[PDB]
Amino acid sequence: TRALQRAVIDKTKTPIETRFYPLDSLRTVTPKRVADNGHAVSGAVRDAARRLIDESITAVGGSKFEVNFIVGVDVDYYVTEPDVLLEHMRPVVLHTFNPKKVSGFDADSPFTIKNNLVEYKVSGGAAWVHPVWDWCEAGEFIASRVRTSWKEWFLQLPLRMIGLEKVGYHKIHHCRPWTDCPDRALVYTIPQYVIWRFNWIDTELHVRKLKRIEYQDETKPGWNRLEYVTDKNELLVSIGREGEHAQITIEKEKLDMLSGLSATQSVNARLIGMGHKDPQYTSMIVQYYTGKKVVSPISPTVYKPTMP
Amino acid sequence: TRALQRAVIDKTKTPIETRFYPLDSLRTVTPKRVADNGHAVSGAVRDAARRLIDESITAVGGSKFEVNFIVGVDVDYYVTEPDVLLEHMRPVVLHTFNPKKVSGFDADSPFTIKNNLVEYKVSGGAAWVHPVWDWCEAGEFIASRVRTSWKEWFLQLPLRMIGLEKVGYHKIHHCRPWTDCPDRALVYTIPQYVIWRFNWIDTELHVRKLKRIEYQDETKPGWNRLEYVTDKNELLVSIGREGEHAQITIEKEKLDMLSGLSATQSVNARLIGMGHKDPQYTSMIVQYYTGKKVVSPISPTVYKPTMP
Amino acid sequence: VANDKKPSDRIAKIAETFVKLMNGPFKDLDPLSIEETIERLLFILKVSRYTLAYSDIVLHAEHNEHWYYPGRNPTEIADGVCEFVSDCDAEVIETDFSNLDGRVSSWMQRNIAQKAMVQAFRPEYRDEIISFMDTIINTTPHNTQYNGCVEFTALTFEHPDAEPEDLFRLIGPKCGDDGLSRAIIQKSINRAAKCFGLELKVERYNPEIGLCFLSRVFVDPLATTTTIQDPLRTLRKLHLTTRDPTIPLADAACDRVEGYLCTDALTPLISDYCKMVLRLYGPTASTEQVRNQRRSRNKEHPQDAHLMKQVLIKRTAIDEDQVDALIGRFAAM
Amino acid sequence: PDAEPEDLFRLIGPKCGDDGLSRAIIQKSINRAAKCFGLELKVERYNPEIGLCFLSRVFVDPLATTTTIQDPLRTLRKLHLTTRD
C-alpha cells in the first residue's frame, strides 16, 4: 500500500554520536570462571562483574551513572521495566538473569518459576519476584520510547492524537562470560537514532519491543517450557513443573519424536532404546508426556547464612 | 500511583549509630563442635554459647542486658515474641531453635511438632511448647514496632487513626556454628533507622515482619513439611507426621519426581531404581505419597536424669 | 609470547591506587605539535608525539621524581644511585626482568599504561590515544610504568595498613628493566610477580662483588660514586664483535673502544683491551670522518683505582696474580 | 599492518622476475607469506664475504664499487660442458 512509501518519506531521522567510543574491550571477551574451585557465590560473581564493567569504563575513559554510561548490576527488581533505562538513549550495560533452565540452582541461590514471574530467592539478600523482559531473543534492533517533559507531552497531545510517537533504536549484544553461572548474561546496548512512527504501519526490519516472557505452555498446563542453543549447534529444551524445583534438559529432536506417541509403555520402551536409564529423567519425561498436574504445596524454607 | 512518591517524600528517617561497634568477632566465625566425643549435652552447648557471646561482648568492650547489648540464650519460651526484644532498637543476639528437621533428636533432647507449635522437651529442664518466628528466611531487613509510653500512645492516637506507624529496621545474620547441633542457630541483629509508614502502601525492599511458621501441609493433612539448603548447593526436604517422631531427609528433586506418580507400585519401583533399599526410608516415602493419616496416641515418657 | 594472566581482585585496588598516585596533581595535558615532536630528541612519531609529552609532564614532575629515574643524564643517574644507596645504608635489591615487553599481560597493559595516558591527556584526545594504545597492544615509558606498578604492588603487600600516598612516597629509583628497592621485600617480590603473572629475578646486594644496575658496577657505593661498565656481561663477549658484515672490522672496533674510553677509561682488564684494539685495528681502520658520515657509526675517579681493581677482580672471580698475568699477556701482544 | 597502503608500497625495492631485493627485517616472515599464498620461497642473508647474488650477477663490494661479474656458483660447475644443439 501507499502507506509504506508515505512512512519511508516520513524519515525524520536524527542519528547522534556523542563520542560514544565503542566498548570493544567489553565485546568479544573470552568467558571466564570467577571461582577458583567448588562454585562461586552471588557476592563473588557480582564483584567480578562490577570489576569487569568498571575497568572497561575506565579504559574507555567515559563516566557512568550507577543506579542502586548507564550501568546496572542485578537490578532487575529495582527497575520495573528496561524502557525506563532505554528512554535516555545512552549506552546501557546490564548484568541480568536470563536463565537457560526453567528452574534449579542459580549460582548459589535456588530459583523457581511460578506463573510468568521468577521466584528468585538470593542466598544473601531479599527474595526477588520479577519477570524477564525478553533480552536474548533473535534480533539486534529494539524500539523504545523517549523521555519527554510533561510540557512536551501536552505539545505532542494534538500530534499524538493521530497516532504519532517518538521511537528510539538500539543495537544489542550479550556475552554469558561465566560457565559456572550460565543463567546470567552481560547485556550490551548501543543507541542508533530516533524517528517518528505511525501506529498502524509495519516495519521492514521487524524491530521488537521488550516484552514479558510467557514460559507457561498452553498445551501442557501446570508446566513451564524453554529451549536454548548449545555450543555444538544443538537445540536443547528445558522443562519442569511450575513453581517447583525439578527440571530436565533434552534435545528438542528426541522430545519431538516422543511427544507424538500414544502409549506411555511405548514412551518408556523408546527411552530405554536410547540408553537413558536414570529414573529421574525417564519419569519426568513420562510425567510431561502425560501432562500430570500436581498441586505443589507452599512450605517454609531454611537457608544458609552468608559466609563473607 | 502517586502514593509511591508521596511515601518517598515522607522519609522521616533518623538513623542512629550509638558507637555500636560491629561484632565482627562474632561474624564470620568457623563452626566448631563443642563435645570432645560422643555427643554434647544441652547444658554443654548452652555453656559454650554463653562463653562465646560473653567473650565477644568483652572484646568489643560494650555491656549487655542479660534476660533470664541485649542477649538471650534459649529464651524462646521466656519471650512471647521477638518484637518485644526488637522494639528497643538495640543490638540483639539470640541462641534459638530453628531446626532443619521436622522432628527427631535435638542435641540430646528429643522434639516433635504438633500443630504449628514445637513440643520441645529438654532432657534437663521444663518442657517447652512455643512456636518459631521465621528467623532464617530470605531477607536481611525486618520491620518492627518501637517502644512508646502510654502518653505517647495517646499523643499518636489522632496520628495513628489515619494509619501512621513508627517502624524500626534491622540487619540480620546467623551462623549455625555447631555441627552436632545443626538445629540451633546464633542469630545476629543490627538496627538501622526509624521511619513513618502508611498502612496501605507497599515497600520496595520487601521488608518482612517475623511471623509464626506454618509447617503443616494443606495438601497432606496430618503431615509436616520442611526443606533447607545444603553445603553443596542441594535443596533437601524433611517431612514427617505431625506430633510424631519419624522423619526423613530427601532431595526435593526426587520428591518432586515421585509426587506425580499414580501407582504406589510405580513409586516402589522408582525407589528401587535409585538404589534406596532401607525400608524405613521407602515405607515413609510411600506413606507420605498416599497421605496416610494415623491417630498417634499420647503416652507417658520416661526420660533420663541429668548427669552434670 | 603473549599472556592473558589477569590479576586477582585485591590487586586491582592496589593498581588503581598506584595509578592515581602516578597521576598526582597533573589532571590536564595537551598533545605536542608534529614539529615540536620532530625536534624533540613513520611509526615511532605517531606514538612519540604523545608519549614524550606525557613523560615530560607527569613522569618528570615534582611528585614523581622519587621513582622515575629513566630520563636523566648519566651524571644525574650516578648521583641518584649514590643518594639512594646512602639512604638505604647499602641495603638495596636489584630487579632484572626478562622480556618485559613480551610478557606484560593485557590486563596490566589496559589498566596501567592506558589508564595513566588517558588520565594524563585531555579528554578531546581520548580517541587518538586509545587507538594508539590498541595498536600497541596488538617503548621506553611502558617499562617504567610496569616497574612502578610492580614496586607499588610490593609496597602495598609489605605494608597493607599504611595510606597509599605514604606507601608510594617510598618508591625508589626505577629505570625500565632495571630498578632499586628495599631488601626487606626480597622474598615477597616473587609472590607479587606470580600474582601479576610476571617473572622476577632478584639478587641480594653484596659489597664483595659490587652492585649491578643499568649494566653499571658500583665499586664502593658507600663512599665513592665511581662506576664502570658491567664486567660480567661484557667481558665474556667483548672479544666478539656483533657489527653488520658490511662495516670493516677496524671501524667497528674503533667505535667500540671509543665508547669504552668515553665510559670505562680507567677500568682494569678493559683499558688494556681497548688500547690494544686501538693499536692494532687503529692504523688499519678507515678515515674517521668517513665513519662519521656513515650510518653504522652509531650502531655500537683516580683516587680509588686500587678499590676499583679489587672490585673488578671480585666481579670476575680472577686471582690478583692471575689478573696481573692476564694484564701482562694483553699488553705484550 | 598499521601503515597506509600507499606509504607501505612506496618502500617496494627493486624486483625483476624471479629475482628481487627486499629488506632483511622480513627474512623470517617472508616464508609465512609464501605459505599463505601457497608459493615456495628461498631466502639467503646478505654476506659480504661471499658477495651478493642478484640476476646471476655477483657484486664484489656493493658498499663502495659497482663492479659486477657473472655468477660463479652457477656457471663454473657447468661452463666446461656446452649445451648447444
DSSP string covering B2-70, please?
A: HHHHHHHH---------S----TTTSS------SSSS---HHHHHHHHHHHHHHHHHHH----EE---E
Report the alpha-carbon distance of residue A280 to residue A266 in Å, rounded. Answer: 18
Within the 102-121 window of chain C, which residues sit less than 8 Å (CB to CB) from chain A?
107, 110-111, 114-115, 118
Cell numbers for C152: 607499588
From start to end of chain A, where are the E strands?
65-66, 70-73, 92-97, 104-106, 109-114, 117-120, 128-130, 142-144, 164-173, 184-198, 223-229, 235-241, 248-251, 301-302
Q: For residue D70, give the H/E element and its range.
A: strand D68-70
C-alpha dihedral, C161 to C164 to C170 to C175, nearest 10°: 130
User: Hey, is A19 helix, strand or coil?
Assistant: coil
User: Hey, is A73 helix, strand or coil?
Assistant: strand
Report the alpha-carbon distance of residue A53 to residue A96 in Å, rounded. Answer: 13
Phi-psi region of D47 (alpha: psi -120 to 50; beta: other; left: phi over 0): beta
Contact at CB, C4 and A59, closer than 8 angstroms: no
A233 to chain B, minimum CA–CA distance in Å?
29
Q: Are B296 and B243 in contact (CB under 8 A)?
A: yes
| Burial of residue C104 (number of CB atoms within 10 Å: 0-12, 13-18, 19+) | buried
Among candidate residues A141, A144, A14, the one with its CA nearest the CA of residue A81: A144
Pick the residue from chain B with its C-alpha nearest to A107: B233
Cβ neighbour number for residue B220 with a 10 Å cutoff: 19
Report the alpha-carbon distance of residue A243 to residue A113 in Å, rounded. Answer: 5
| Distances B149 to B154, B156, B206, C219 between C-alpha atoms, Å | 9, 10, 29, 85
Report the alpha-carbon distance of residue A210 to residue C164 in Å, rounded. Answer: 46
CA atoms lying within 13 Å on the CB side of residue C263: 14
This entry's atomic model was obtained through: cryo-EM
Q: Are B207 and B141 in contact (CB under 8 A)?
A: yes
Q: What is the DSSP letter of A296?
A: P
User: Hey, is B165 helix, strand or coil?
Assistant: strand
Cβ neighbour number for residue D61 with a 10 Å cutoff: 12
Among candidate residues B131, B140, B94, the one with its CA nearest the CA of residue B213: B131
Q: What is the DSSP letter of A68?
A: -
Report the alpha-carbon distance of residue B38 to residue B50 in Å, rounded. Answer: 21
Among candidate residues A210, A84, A65, A79, the one with its CA nearest the CA of residue A147: A84
Among candidate residues A210, A262, A259, the one with its CA nearest the CA of residue A87: A210
Report the alpha-carbon distance of residue B181 to residue B185 in Å, rounded. Answer: 9
Name residue A204's amino acid.
Answer: E
Cβ neighbour number for residue B155 with a 10 Å cutoff: 12
What residues of A are in contact with residue B139 (Cβ under 8 Å)? 125-127
Report the alpha-carbon distance of residue B172 to residue B92 in Å, rounded. Answer: 10
Q: For the range B6-11, what are the long-range contacts, defined as Cβ-Cβ under 8 Å and sequence gap of 24 or more?
A: B6/B201, B7/B197, B7/B198, B7/B201, B10/B196, B10/B198, B11/B195
List active site positions of C: 177
Pick the residue from chain C with its C-alpha nearest to A57: C115
Q: Is the dihedral of CA C235, C240, C246, C251 positive or negative?
A: positive
Report the alpha-carbon distance of residue A78 to residue B120 in Å, rounded. Answer: 42
C97 to chain A, minimum CA–CA distance in Å?
26
**Angle value at C-alpha C65, between C62 and C67, nearest 5 degrees:** 150
Please check whether residue A302 touches B, CB under 8 A.
yes
Please check whether residue C43 touches D, CB under 8 A.
yes
Residue in the block written with cell 563520542: A19
Cell numbers for D22: 627486499
User: Hey, is C132 helix, strand or coil?
Assistant: helix
Contact at CB, C118 and A59, closer than 8 angstroms: yes
From start to end of C116-224, where are the E strands?
174-175, 178-182, 200-204, 211-213, 216-218
Please check whether residue A201 touches C, CB under 8 A.
no
φ/ψ of residue C245, rounded to 5: -65, -25
With an 8 Å CB cutoff and a minimum of 3 pairs, decide whether chains A and C touch.
yes
Please check whether residue B155 touches A, CB under 8 A.
no
Q: What is the DSSP letter of C112?
A: I
From start to end of chain C, where are the E strands?
92-97, 174-175, 178-182, 200-204, 211-213, 216-218, 227-229
From start to end of C222-316, where are the E strands?
227-229
φ/ψ of residue A28, rounded to 5: 55, 60
| Distances B287 to B282, C282, D45 between C-alpha atoms, Å | 9, 108, 89
From start to end of chain B, where are the E strands?
65-66, 70-73, 92-97, 104-106, 109-114, 117-120, 128-130, 142-144, 164-173, 184-198, 223-229, 235-241, 248-251
Q: Which residues pair with A248 in a beta bridge?
A: A239
What residues of B are in contact with residue A241 (Cβ under 8 Å)? 256, 260
Report the alpha-carbon distance of residue C205 to residue C91 in Å, rounded. Answer: 7
User: Hey, is C233 helix, strand or coil?
Assistant: helix
φ/ψ of residue D36, rounded to 5: -65, -45
Contact at CB, C127 and A30, closer than 8 angstroms: no
Pick the residue from chain A with its C-alpha nearest to C123: A61
| Radius of gyration of chain C, Cα coordinates, nearest whole angstrom | 22
Q: Are C217 and C230 in contact (CB under 8 A)?
A: yes
Chains contacting B (3 or more CB pairs within 8 Å): A
Q: Is the dihedral of CA B21, B22, B25, B31 positive or negative?
A: positive
What residues of A are in contact with residue C9 (Cβ under 8 Å)? 47-48, 51
Chains contacting C (3 or more CB pairs within 8 Å): A, D
φ/ψ of residue C329, rounded to 5: -65, -40
Q: Are A81 and A94 in contact (CB under 8 A)?
A: no
Among candidate residues C69, C65, C43, C39, the one with its CA nearest the CA of residue C53: C39
Cell numbers for A119: 521466584
Report the alpha-carbon distance of residue C103 to residue A23 in Å, rounded. Answer: 25
Nearest residue, CB atoms, A110 vs list B136, B140, B235: B235
What residues of A are in contact with residue B217 (Cβ under 8 Å)? 297, 299
Specify whether D18 is catalytic. Answer: yes
Please check whether residue A84 touches B, CB under 8 A.
no
What residues of D are in contact with residue C249 (Cβ under 8 Å)? none
Please check whether residue B24 touches A, CB under 8 A.
no
Report the alpha-carbon distance of residue B288 to residue B224 in Å, rounded. Answer: 10
Among candidate residues B198, B177, B146, B224, the one with its CA nearest the CA of residue B27: B177
Name residue B107's amino acid.
Answer: A
What residues of C are in contact with residue A25 (Cβ under 8 Å)? 110
Cell numbers for A297: 504445596
Cβ neighbour number for residue B192 with a 10 Å cutoff: 17
C-alpha dihedral, A275 to A276 to A277 to A279, nearest 10°: -160
Contact at CB, B139 and A127, closer than 8 angstroms: yes
Among candidate residues B202, B208, B213, B211, the one with its CA nearest the CA of residue B169: B208
Report the alpha-carbon distance of residue D60 to residue D66 in Å, rounded. Answer: 8
| Distances A44 to A40, C137, C265 between C-alpha atoms, Å | 6, 29, 61
What residues of A are in contact with residue C3 (Cβ under 8 Å)? none
Please check whether residue A130 touches B, CB under 8 A.
no
Q: Are B143 and B208 in contact (CB under 8 A)?
A: yes
| Radius of gyration of chain B, Cα coordinates, nearest whole angstrom | 23
Report the alpha-carbon distance of residue A156 to residue A148 in Å, rounded. Answer: 10
Among candidate residues A26, A134, A150, A146, the one with its CA nearest the CA of residue A86: A146
| Distances C231 to B141, B238, C188, C219, C267 between C-alpha atoms, Å | 70, 78, 29, 12, 10
Chain A / chain B CB contacts < 8 angstroms: 105
Among candidate residues C222, C245, C218, the one with its CA nearest the CA of residue C299: C245
> Pairing mode, if any, of strands A301-302 and B223-229?
parallel
Pick the residue from chain A with its C-alpha nearest to C113: A59
Please check whether residue A277 touches C, CB under 8 A.
no
Phi-psi region of B48 (alpha: psi -120 to 50; beta: other; left: phi over 0): alpha
For chain A, the distance separating the N- and C-terminal CA atoms, rounded to the nearest angstrom, is: 64
**Angle value at C-alpha A298, between A296 and A303, nearest 5 degrees:** 120
Report the alpha-carbon distance of residue C274 to residue C269 in Å, rounded. Answer: 9
Nearest-10 crossing angle of helices B264-273, A279-290: 150
Q: What is the DSSP letter of A208?
A: B
Report the alpha-carbon distance of residue A10 to residue A117 in Å, rounded. Answer: 39
Taking every pair of Cα atoms in chain A, the longest distance, rounded to a whole number of angstroms, is 69
With an 8 Å CB cutoff and a minimum of 3 pairs, decide whether chains C and B touch.
no
Report the alpha-carbon distance of residue A179 to residue C67 in Å, rounded. Answer: 42
